[PDB]
Amino acid sequence: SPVQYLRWGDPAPIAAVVFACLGLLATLFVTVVFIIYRDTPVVKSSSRELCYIILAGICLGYLCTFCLIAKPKQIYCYLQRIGIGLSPAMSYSALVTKTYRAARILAMSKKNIFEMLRIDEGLRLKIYKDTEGYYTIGIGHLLTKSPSLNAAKSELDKAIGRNTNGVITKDEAEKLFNQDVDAAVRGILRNAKLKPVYDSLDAVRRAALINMVFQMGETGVAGFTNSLRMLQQKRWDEAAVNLAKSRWYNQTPNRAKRVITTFRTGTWDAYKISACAQLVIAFILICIQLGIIVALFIMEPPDIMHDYPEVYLICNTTNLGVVAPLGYNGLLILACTFYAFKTRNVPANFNEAKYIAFTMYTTCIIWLAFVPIYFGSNYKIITMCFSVSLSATVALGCMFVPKVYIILAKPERN
Ligand SMILES: CCCCCCCC/C=C\CCCCCCCC(=O)O
Ligand SMILES: CCCCCCCC/C=C\CCCCCCCC(=O)O
Ligand SMILES: CN1CC(=O)N=C1NC(=O)Nc1cccc(Cl)c1
């Protein structure tokens, strides 16, 4: 009984139980909210099937402390190794399929802007010079400002990853072009005149604004004071009429007409330009962890330590019984963090990606700090209980609590 150890002067078992119960309660509250309000734009936008797999992992995470703090029975040593290994794998492998899809969607958004300027601005697959003698390649991607041609091929190989001999491909010029777009968006966000208009426009019309920035510069796009105000108010027809009167339209009419048409429809007509698959891949990534656990059951069978007479249940789990599923879970965390950081600025689903990236930042530090803390500890059971509950609470508090707040507290925003 955890209450017996509390009055005896040890409040660790009773504290880990309350932690797990409160976590089970909050996990129960969060899940019911997503079941009831399943048809609301906030829940319908993200992957609903993957969230139930994440919440089930968090649920099993808090349940781990009930087999760590349990009576000396044999199946609990089996459930310990099966929960401390699978419950993180369930949450992280479902989250890696969510973050992987968010990155492929983001990569496809840059494929349509690259084809936009390949037709409008041009593209060279070998090194040239711009109007001021700076070595350049691709769609105006500056390589260096040194007069040495060997210096350009050096930076080019360092940017591509192979010996190019001064020649690249369309996919390699796109890799350099994505860096120029990221630098252009930062310049627009650092501009007081273009920042509000950029935030109101959708993904397609943002590309048309960036198209104008690449042709005329940030200070040149800021000159369309009236048209930018029309685009912000979603007066597309008025903006296209006003833009067709500009000197920019009369000097390069073949290009300005396509950018203007994009502002009109919000589509790519002026230019030539799975759900069940996520559950299967997540299911495959969970069975791999389970296969590791079952394989270690056969190598190192679970057994109750000693032949004793206690609240603490000591099993014969070795380092390999811990490190092998711990390392696989770590790989799931690295992959999650890689795609979460890659999409940290994606604003879809009420900035859902911002909260996922922050969750993986804390998860890495928590899991990294766990290795020296645990394997150097003489209270491994309790340090394991709090670690699993803390890591489960991070994912539940950072990813789901903000989404539940918007549902109940901000019904009109949703
Ligand atoms: C870069 C971010 C990393 C985040 C995940 C880290 C997870 C750590 C997982 C496995 C590392 C295992 C190290 C075990 C060393 C042996 C311990 C021992 O047996 O004494
Ligand atoms: C910002 C804080 C990050 C903390 C980083 C900690 C890095 C530890 C990760 C892996 C080290 C594994 C080496 C073996 C651990 C044995 C520890 C021990 O025996 O006490
Ligand atoms: C073994 N260790 C060391 C550590 O620091 N964390 C764990 N295990 C874990 O966190 N499992 C889990 C369970 C439910 C949800 C989530 Cl997100 C994670």
UniProtKB/Swiss-Prot annotation:
Protein name according to UniProt: Metabotropic glutamate receptor 5
Lineage per the UniProt record: Eukaryota, Metazoa, Chordata, Craniata, Vertebrata
Disulphide-bonded residues: 77-315
Origin species: Homo sapiens
Coiled coil (UniProt feature): none
Result of changing residue 352 to A: Increased constitutive signaling activity
Cytoplasmic-side positions: 37-46, 101-278, 342-354
Transmembrane segments: 14-36, 47-69, 78-100, 279-299, 320-341, 355-377, 381-402
Subunit annotation: The PPXXF motif binds HOMER1, HOMER2 and HOMER3. Interacts with SIAH1, RYR1, RYR2, ITPR1, SHANK1, SHANK3 and TAMALIN. Interacts with NCDN. Isoform 2 interacts with NECAB2. Interacts with CAMK2A.
